[PDB]
Ligand binder design. Structure first.
Ligand SMILES: Nc1ncnc2c1ncn2[C@@H]1O[C@H](COP(=O)(O)OP(=O)(O)OP(=O)(O)O)[C@@H](O)[C@H]1O
Ligand SMILES: [Mg+2]
Lengths: 86, 201
DNA sequence: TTTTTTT
DNA sequence: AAAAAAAAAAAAAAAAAAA
């Protein structure tokens, strides 16, 4: 319902067939069984790359919080390289 | 346009539909003039669909199936006309398609006997009938397009190409162009073909 | 010995 | 008063052959 959003997000499961393309998505943030950072959606789940993340200050980024993630998918592994988060 | 990939196959079909000229010499007899192409590949890779498209696109074409045909009934038949009470030759399947194209499906699933007849019509493009007091040579200058399955369920890329095919080399060397199609499993191609198919439906 | 294929 | 039949297609049982 936000004014700015009329770009559109993409469900997680629709990220299998593309790579080297920027996207936008949101969902639960938690730790997978293995112990890595993952985002969960009713469609599915992916992994998170954090090594070069610049978050929006003023928020308590906590597991269990809805977050908006902008990044680049990479099919070589399964890492959604994040560059911004709010 | 509804078939994804296989660009070189489309080019081969285009070149085959309008093949080269015939050559006849007062001393050199005759030289074959058109092109023949064979398809062997793993199941469900859109060979029959392309063959059906070739059926619809070409001017004159006849459809045959390996299991649904008999070699003797494919070239000529000895039947008696009702009004005259005289037995006269009845034109066979591929004779009707002279100068046209004949498409065969399940080619390797045909009875071996019929195969020898094919070799004859691939040798000098002429079939001879000598039976029941009739001796006649019939002209048949048609081109053949066909598709066949490998001996196993799927093509084995590590084996001898002759090991994967059930047809003898005697008639396989006759065919000008042989194509091998295999559905390599790549997620990018999977997504692309999925988009195309969903666009079609 | 058994199943296959040809007559 | 008589066209009647060679050429095909399809269904078996026996024997022999290959694994
Ligand atoms: N590149 C393709 N573009 C569109 N459809 C395709 C493509 N590849 C396969 N298909 C689809 O795959 C299906 C396979 O159908 P079809 O029986 O004609 O294939 P085939 O490879 O000729 O198989 P077979 O050897 O069993 O006859 C079709 O429904 C066809 O639409
Ligand atoms: Mg097919």
């Amino acid at each position: 319902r936000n004014e700015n959003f009329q770009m559109s997000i993409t469900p997680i499961k629709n990220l299998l067939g593309r790579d080297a393309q920027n996207f936008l998505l949101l969902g639960l943030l938690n730790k997978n069984f293995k112990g890595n950072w993952s985002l969960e959606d009713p469609s599915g789940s992916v992994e998170i790359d954090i090594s070069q993340t610049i978050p929006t200050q003023g928020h308590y980024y906590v597991p269990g919080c809805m977050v908006l993630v902008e990044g680049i998918y990479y099919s070589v592994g399964n890492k959604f390289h994040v560059t911004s988060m709010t | 346009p509804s078939i994804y990939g296989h660009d070189h196959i489309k080019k081969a079909i285009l070149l085959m539909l309008m093949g080269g000229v015939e050559k006849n010499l007062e001393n050199g007899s005759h030289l074959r003039g058109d092109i023949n192409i064979l398809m062997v590949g793993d199941p469900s890779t859109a060979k029959s669909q392309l063959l059906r498209f070739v059926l619809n696109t070409a001017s004159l074409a006849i459809a045959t199936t390996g299991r649904g045909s008999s070699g003797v009934g494919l070239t000529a038949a000895v039947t008696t006309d009702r009004e005259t009470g005289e037995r006269r030759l009845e034109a066979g399947a591929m004779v009707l398609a002279d100068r046209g194209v004949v498409c065969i499906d399940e080619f390797d699933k045909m009875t071996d006997v019929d195969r020898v007849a094919i070799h004859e019509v691939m040798e000098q493009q002429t079939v001879t009938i000598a039976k029941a007091g009739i001796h006649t040579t019939l002209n048949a200058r048609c081109s053949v397009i066909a598709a066949a399955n490998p001996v196993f369920g799927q093509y084995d890329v590590n084996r001898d190409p002759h090991q994967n095919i059930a047809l003898p080399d005697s008639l396989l060397s006759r065919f000008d162009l042989l194509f091998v199609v295999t559905d390599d499993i790549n997620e990018i191609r999977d997504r692309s073909i999925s988009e195309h198919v969903l666009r079609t439906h």
